[PDB]
PDB file of C-alpha atoms and ligand atoms in Angstrom:
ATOM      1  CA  UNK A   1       0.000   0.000   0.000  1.00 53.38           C
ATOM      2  CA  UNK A   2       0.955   3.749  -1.230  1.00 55.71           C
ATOM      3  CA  UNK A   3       0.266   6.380   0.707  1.00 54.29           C
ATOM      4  CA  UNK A   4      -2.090   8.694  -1.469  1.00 56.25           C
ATOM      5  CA  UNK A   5       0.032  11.934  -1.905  1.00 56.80           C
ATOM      6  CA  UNK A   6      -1.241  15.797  -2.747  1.00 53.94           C
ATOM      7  CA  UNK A   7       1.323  17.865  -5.256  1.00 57.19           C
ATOM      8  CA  UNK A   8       1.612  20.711  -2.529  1.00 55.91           C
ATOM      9  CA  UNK A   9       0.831  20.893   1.209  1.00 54.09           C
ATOM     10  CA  UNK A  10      -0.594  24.155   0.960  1.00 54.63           C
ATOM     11  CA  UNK A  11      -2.805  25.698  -2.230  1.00 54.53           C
ATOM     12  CA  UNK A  12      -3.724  29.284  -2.255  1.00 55.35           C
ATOM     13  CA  UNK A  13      -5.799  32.264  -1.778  1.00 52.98           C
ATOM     14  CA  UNK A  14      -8.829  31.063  -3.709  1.00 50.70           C
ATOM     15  CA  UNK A  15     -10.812  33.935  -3.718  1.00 52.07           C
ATOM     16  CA  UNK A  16     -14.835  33.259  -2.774  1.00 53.75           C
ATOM     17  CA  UNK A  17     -16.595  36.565  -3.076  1.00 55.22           C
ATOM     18  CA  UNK A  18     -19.688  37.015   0.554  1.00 58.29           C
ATOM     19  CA  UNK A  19     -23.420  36.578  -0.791  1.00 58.26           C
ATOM     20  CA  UNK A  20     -22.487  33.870  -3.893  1.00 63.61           C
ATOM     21  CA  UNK A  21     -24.668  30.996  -3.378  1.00 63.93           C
ATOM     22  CA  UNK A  22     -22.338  27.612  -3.403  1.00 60.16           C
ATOM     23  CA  UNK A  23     -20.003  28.427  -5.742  1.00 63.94           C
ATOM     24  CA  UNK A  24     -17.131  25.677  -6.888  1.00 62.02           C
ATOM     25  CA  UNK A  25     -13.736  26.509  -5.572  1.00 64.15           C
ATOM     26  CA  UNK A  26     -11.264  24.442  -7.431  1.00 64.32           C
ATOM     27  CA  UNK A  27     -10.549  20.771  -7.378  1.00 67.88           C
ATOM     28  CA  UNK A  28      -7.672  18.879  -5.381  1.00 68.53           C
ATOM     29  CA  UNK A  29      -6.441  15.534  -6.340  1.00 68.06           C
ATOM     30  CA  UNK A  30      -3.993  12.956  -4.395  1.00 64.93           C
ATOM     31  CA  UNK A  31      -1.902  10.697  -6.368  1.00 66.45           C
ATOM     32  CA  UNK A  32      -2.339   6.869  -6.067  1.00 64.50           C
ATOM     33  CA  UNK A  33      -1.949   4.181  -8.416  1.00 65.15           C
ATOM     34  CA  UNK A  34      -2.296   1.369  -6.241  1.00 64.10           C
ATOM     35  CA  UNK A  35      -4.671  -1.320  -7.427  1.00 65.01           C
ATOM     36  CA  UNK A  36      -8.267  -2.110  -6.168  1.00 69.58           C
ATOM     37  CA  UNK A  37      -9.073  -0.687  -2.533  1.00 66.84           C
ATOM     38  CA  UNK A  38      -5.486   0.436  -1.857  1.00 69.31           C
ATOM     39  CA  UNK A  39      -5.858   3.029  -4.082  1.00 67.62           C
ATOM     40  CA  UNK A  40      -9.591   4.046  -3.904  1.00 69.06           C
ATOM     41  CA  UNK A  41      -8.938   7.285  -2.553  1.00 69.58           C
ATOM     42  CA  UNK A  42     -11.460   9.371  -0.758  1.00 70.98           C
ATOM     43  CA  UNK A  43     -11.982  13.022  -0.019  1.00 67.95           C
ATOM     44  CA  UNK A  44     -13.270  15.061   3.205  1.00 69.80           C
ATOM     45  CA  UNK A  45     -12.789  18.764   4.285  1.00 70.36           C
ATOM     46  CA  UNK A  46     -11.860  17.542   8.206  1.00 73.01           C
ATOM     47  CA  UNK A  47     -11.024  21.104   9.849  1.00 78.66           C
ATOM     48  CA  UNK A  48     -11.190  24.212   9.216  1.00 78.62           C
ATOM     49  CA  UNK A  49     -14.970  24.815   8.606  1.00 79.77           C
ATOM     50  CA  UNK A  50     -16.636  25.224  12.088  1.00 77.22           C
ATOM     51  CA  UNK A  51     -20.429  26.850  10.165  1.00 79.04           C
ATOM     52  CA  UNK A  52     -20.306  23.641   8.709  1.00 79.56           C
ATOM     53  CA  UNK A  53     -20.612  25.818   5.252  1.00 80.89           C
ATOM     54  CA  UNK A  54     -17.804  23.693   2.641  1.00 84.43           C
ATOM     55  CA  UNK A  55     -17.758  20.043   1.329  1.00 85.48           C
ATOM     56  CA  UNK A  56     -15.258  18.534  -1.147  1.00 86.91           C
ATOM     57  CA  UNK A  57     -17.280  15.620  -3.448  1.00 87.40           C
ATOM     58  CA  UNK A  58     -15.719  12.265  -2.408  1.00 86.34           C
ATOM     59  CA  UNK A  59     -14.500  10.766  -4.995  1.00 86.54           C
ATOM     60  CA  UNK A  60     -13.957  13.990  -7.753  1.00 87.85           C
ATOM     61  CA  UNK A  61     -12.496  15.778  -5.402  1.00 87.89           C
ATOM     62  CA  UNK A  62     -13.892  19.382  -6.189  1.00 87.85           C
ATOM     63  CA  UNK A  63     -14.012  21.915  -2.875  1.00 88.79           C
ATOM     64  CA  UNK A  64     -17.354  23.847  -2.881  1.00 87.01           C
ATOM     65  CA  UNK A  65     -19.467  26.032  -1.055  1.00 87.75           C
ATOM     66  CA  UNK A  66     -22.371  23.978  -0.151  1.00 87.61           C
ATOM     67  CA  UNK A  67     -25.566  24.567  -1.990  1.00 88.11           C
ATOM     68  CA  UNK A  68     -27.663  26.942  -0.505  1.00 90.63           C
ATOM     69  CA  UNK A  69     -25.260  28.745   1.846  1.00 91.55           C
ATOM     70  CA  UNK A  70     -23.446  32.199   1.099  1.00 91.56           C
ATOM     71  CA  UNK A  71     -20.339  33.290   2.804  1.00 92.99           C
ATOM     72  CA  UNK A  72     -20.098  36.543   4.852  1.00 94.46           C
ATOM     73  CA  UNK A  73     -16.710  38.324   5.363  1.00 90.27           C
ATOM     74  CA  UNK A  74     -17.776  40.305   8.121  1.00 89.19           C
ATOM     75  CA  UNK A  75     -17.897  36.769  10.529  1.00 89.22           C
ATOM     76  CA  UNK A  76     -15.110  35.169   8.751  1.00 87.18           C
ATOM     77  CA  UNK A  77     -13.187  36.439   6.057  1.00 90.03           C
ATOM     78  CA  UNK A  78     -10.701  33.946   5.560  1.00 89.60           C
ATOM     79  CA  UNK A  79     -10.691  30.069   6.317  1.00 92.40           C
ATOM     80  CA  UNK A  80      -7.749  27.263   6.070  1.00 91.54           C
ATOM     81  CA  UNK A  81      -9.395  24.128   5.318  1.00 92.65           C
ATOM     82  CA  UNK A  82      -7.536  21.076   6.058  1.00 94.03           C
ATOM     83  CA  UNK A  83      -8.117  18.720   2.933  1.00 93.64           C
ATOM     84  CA  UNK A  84      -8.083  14.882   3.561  1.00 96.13           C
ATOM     85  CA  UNK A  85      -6.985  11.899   1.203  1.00 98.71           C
ATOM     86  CA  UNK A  86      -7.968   8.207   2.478  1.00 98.36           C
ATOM     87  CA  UNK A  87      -7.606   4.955   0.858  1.00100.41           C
ATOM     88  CA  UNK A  88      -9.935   1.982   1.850  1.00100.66           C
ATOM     89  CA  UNK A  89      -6.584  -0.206   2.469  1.00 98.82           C
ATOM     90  CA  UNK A  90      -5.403  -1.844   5.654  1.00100.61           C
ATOM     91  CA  UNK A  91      -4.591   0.378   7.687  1.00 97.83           C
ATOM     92  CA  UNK A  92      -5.962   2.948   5.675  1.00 99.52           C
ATOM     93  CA  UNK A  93      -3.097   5.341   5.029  1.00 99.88           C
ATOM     94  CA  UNK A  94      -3.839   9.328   4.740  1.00100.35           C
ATOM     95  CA  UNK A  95      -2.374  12.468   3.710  1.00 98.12           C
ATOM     96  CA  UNK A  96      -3.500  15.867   4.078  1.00 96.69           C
ATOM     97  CA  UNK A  97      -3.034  19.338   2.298  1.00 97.48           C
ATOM     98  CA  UNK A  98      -4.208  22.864   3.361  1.00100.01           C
ATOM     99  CA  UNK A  99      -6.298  25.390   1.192  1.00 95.20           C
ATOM    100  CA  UNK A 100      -6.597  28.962   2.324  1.00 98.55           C
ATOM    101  CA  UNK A 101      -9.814  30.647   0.978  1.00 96.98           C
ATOM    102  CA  UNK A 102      -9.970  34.326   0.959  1.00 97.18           C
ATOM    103  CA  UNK A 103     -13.788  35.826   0.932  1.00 95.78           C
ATOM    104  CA  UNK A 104     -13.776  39.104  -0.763  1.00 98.28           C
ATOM    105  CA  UNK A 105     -16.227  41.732   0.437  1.00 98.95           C
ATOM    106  CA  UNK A 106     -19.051  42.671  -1.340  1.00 97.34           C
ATOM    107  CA  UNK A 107     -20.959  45.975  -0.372  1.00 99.05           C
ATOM    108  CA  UNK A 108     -23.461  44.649   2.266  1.00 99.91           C
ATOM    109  CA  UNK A 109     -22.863  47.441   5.325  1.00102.07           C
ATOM    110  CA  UNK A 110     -24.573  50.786   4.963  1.00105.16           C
ATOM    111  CA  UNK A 111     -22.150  53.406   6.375  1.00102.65           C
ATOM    112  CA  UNK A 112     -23.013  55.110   9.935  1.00102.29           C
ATOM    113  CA  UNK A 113     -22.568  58.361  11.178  1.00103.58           C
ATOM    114  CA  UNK A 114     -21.129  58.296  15.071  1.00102.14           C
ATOM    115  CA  UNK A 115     -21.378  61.307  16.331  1.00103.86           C
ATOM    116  CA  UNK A 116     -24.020  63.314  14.017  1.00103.86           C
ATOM    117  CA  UNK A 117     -27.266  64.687  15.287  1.00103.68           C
ATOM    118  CA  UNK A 118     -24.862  67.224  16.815  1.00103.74           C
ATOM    119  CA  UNK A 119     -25.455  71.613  17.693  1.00104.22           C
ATOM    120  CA  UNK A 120     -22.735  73.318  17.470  1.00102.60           C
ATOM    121  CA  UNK A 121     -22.385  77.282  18.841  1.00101.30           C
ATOM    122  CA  UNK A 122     -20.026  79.581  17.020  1.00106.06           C
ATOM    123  CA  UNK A 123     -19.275  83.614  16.625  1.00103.28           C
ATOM    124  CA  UNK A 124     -21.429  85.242  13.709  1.00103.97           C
ATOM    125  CA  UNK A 125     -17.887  86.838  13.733  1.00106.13           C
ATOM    126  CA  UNK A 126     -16.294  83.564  12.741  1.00105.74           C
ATOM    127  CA  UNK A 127     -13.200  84.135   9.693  1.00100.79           C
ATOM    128  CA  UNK A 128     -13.937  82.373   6.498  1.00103.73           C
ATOM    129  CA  UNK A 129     -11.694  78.280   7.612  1.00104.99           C
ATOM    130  CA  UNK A 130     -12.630  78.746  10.983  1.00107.44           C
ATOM    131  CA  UNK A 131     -13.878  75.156  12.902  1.00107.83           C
ATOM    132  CA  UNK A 132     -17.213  74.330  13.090  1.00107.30           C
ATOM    133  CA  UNK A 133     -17.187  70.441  13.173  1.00106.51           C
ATOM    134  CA  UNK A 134     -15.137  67.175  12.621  1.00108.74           C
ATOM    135  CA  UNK A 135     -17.489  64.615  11.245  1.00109.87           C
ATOM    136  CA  UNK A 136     -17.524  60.433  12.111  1.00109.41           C
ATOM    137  CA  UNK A 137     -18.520  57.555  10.701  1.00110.02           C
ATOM    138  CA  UNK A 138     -17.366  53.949  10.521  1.00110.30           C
ATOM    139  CA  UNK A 139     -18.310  50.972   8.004  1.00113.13           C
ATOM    140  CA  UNK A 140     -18.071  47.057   7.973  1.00114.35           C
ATOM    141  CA  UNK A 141     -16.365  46.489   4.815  1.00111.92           C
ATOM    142  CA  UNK A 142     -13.395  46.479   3.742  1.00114.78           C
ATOM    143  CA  UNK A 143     -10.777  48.713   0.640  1.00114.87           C
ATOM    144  CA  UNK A 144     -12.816  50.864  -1.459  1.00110.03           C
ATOM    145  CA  UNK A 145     -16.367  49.680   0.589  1.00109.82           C
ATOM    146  CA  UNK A 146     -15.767  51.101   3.802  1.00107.96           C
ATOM    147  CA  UNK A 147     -13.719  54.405   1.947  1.00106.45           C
ATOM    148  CA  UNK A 148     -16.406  56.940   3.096  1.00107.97           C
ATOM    149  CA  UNK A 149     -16.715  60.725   1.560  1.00108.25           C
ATOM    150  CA  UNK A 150     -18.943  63.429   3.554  1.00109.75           C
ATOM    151  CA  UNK A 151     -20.808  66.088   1.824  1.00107.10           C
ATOM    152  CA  UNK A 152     -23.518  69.144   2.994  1.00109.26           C
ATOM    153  CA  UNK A 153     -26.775  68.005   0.722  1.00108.98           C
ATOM    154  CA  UNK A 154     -29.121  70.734   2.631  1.00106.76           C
ATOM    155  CA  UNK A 155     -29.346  73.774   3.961  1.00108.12           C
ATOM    156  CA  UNK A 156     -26.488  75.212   3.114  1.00106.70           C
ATOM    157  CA  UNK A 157     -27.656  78.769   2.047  1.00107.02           C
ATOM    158  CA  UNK A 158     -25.877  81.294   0.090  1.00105.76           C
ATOM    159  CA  UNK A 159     -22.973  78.305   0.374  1.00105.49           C
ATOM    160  CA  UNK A 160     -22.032  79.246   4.045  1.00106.71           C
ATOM    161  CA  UNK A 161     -20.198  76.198   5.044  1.00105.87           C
ATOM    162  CA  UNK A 162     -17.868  73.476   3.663  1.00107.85           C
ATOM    163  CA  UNK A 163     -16.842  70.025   4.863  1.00108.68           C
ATOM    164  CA  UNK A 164     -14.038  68.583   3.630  1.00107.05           C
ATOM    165  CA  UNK A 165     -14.919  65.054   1.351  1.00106.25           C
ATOM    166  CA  UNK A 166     -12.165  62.840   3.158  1.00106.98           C
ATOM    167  CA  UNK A 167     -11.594  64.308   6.476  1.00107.54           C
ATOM    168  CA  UNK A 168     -15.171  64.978   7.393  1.00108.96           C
ATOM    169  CA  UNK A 169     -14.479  68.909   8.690  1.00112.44           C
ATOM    170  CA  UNK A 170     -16.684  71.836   8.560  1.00113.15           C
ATOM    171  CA  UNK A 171     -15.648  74.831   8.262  1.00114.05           C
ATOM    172  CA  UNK A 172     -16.942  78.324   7.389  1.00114.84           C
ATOM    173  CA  UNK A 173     -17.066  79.272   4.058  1.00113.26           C
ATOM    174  CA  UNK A 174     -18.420  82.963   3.624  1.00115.00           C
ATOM    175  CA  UNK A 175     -18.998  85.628   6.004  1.00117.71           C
ATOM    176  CA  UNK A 176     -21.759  85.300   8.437  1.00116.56           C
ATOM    177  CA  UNK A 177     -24.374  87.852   9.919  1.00116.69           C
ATOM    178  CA  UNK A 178     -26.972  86.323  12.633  1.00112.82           C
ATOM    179  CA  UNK A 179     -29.292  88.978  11.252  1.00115.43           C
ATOM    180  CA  UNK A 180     -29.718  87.941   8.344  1.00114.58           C
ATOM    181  CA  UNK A 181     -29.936  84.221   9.087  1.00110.50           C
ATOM    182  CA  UNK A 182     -29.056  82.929  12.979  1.00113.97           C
ATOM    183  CA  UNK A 183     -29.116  79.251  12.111  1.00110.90           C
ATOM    184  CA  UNK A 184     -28.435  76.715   9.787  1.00111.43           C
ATOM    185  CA  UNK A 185     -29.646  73.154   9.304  1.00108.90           C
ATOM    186  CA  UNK A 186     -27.361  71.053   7.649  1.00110.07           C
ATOM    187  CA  UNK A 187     -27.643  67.976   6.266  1.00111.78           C
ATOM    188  CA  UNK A 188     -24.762  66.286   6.066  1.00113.96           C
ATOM    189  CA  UNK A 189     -24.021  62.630   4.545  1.00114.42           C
ATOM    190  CA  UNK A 190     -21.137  60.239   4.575  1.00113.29           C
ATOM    191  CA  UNK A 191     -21.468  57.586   1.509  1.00113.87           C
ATOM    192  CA  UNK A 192     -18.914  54.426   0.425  1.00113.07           C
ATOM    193  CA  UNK A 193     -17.305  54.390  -2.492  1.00111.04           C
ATOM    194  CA  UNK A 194     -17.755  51.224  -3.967  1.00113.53           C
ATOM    195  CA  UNK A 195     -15.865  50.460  -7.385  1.00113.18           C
ATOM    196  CA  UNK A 196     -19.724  50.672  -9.153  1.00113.75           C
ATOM    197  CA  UNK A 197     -21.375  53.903  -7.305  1.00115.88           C
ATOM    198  CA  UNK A 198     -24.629  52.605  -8.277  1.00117.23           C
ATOM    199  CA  UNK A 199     -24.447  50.204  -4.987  1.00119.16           C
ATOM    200  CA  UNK A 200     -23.279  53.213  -3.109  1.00121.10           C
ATOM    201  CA  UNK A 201     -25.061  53.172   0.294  1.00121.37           C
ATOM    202  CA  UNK A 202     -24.912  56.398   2.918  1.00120.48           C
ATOM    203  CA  UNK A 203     -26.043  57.705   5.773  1.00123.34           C
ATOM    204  CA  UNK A 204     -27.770  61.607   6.565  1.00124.50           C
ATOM    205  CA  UNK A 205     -27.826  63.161   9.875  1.00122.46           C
ATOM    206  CA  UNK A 206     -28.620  67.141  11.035  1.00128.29           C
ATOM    207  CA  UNK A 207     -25.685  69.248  12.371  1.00128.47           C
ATOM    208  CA  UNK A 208     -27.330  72.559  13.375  1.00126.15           C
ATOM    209  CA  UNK A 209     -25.108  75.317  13.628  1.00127.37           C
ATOM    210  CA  UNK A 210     -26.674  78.430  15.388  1.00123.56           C
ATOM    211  CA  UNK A 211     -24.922  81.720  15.560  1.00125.76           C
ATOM    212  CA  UNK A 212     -23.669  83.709  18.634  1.00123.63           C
ATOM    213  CA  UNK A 213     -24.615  87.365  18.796  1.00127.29           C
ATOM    214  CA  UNK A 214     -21.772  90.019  18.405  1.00127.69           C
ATOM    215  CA  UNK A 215     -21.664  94.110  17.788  1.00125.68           C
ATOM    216  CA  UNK A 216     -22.263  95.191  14.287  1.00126.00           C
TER     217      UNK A 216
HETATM  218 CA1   CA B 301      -2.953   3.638  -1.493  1.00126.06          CA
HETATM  219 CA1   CA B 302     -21.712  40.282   4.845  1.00126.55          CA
HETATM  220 CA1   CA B 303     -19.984  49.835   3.065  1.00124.88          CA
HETATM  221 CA1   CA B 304     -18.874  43.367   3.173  1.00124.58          CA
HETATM  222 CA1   CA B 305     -23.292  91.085  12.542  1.00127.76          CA
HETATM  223 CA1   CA B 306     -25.222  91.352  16.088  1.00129.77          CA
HETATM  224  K1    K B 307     -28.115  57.000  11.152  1.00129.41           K
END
C-alpha cells in the first residue's frame, strides 16, 4: 500500500466573493496508483470549517461552497481548510493538504454616522476656515467599501459652510451675519465608495449650527 500523496501541502488564496450561493472553488487531487481498494482514494474537508458551510465531493475531489449557503466576510473572512486523502486499504493510510480561501467583500454594510445629530455654537464673527465640526462615521467592509466621503446636501444657504470630502471637517465658508440668518440646518451625509457607485449606500444626519450674537 501507497500512501495517497497531494502535489503541494498548501494551495492558495482562492478567492470566494460574501453573498455567492455555493459556488465551486477548485478541485484537489492525491496521487495513487495502487490497485483495487489500496488506491480508492477518498476526499473530506476535516477542519477548518466550524459553520459547517464547505464540502469537497468524495470521490472527484472538487471543494465547494455547499448549496444553498453564502459566505459573509464580516464573521469570517478567511478560512484554512484542512483537505483529507484516504484509501480503503489496511490500515488505511492518509495524507492531508491545506487550502486557504480568501472571501472578498461585497458591499453589504450601509455606512453610519457616530457622532451626528450634533449643535454646534459659534461667533457670527467667525473668519472664512474657521472650525465648526469634525465629522464620524465607521463601516463594515473592507478597501474601497468602507472608503467613506462626507458632503452638505441641505441647507447650506448662500454656500455658508464646507466640509471637507475625506476628512469629514466643517468649516466656514463665507462671512456670516446672525441677522440675516441665525441658524443653519445642515444635512450632512457620509457615503462608500464602492468600485460601481450605483451600490453606493450612505447615511444623513442634522448638524445645526446656530450663531452667537456680536456688535455690528
Ligand atoms: Ca494507497
Ligand atoms: Ca456580509
Ligand atoms: Ca460599506
Ligand atoms: Ca462586506
Ligand atoms: Ca453682525
Ligand atoms: Ca449682532
Ligand atoms: K443613522
Amino acid at each position: 500500500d501507497n500512501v495517497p500523496t497531494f502535489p503541494r501541502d498548501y494551495e492558495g488564496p482562492f478567492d470566494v466573493t460574501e453573498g455567492q450561493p455555493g459556488p465551486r472553488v477548485w478541485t484537489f487531487l492525491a496521487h495513487d496508483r495502487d490497485s483495487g481498494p489500496n488506491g480508492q482514494v477518498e476526499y473530506s474537508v476535516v477542519d477548518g470549517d466550524p459553520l459547517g458551510e464547505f464540502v469537497i465531493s468524495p470521490v472527484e475531489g472538487v471543494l465547494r461552497v455547499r448549496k444553498d449557503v453564502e459566505l459573509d466576510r464580516e464573521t469570517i473572512a478567511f478560512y484554512n481548510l484542512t483537505i483529507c486523502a484516504r484509501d480503503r486499504g489496511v490500515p488505511p493510510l492518509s495524507s492531508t493538504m491545506l487550502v486557504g480561501i480568501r472571501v472578498l467583500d461585497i458591499n453589504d454594510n450601509d455606512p453610519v454616522l457616530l457622532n451626528l445629530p450634533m449643535n454646534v455654537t459659534i461667533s457670527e464673527n467667525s473668519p472664512v476656515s474657521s472650525f465648526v465640526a469634525h465629522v464620524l462615521a465607521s463601516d463594515a467592509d473592507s478597501g474601497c467599501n468602507a472608503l467613506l466621503t462626507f458632503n452638505i446636501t441641505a441647507g447650506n444657504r448662500e454656500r455658508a459652510f464646507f466640509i471637507n470630502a475625506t476628512t469629514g471637517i466643517v468649516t466656514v465658508n463665507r462671512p456670516l451675519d446672525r441677522e440675516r440668518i441665525p441658524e443653519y440646518r445642515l444635512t450632512v451625509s457620509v457615503k462608500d465608495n464602492p468600485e460601481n457607485p450605483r451600490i453606493a449606500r450612505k447615511d444623513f444626519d442634522l448638524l445645526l449650527v446656530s450663531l452667537a450674537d456680536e456688535n455690528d
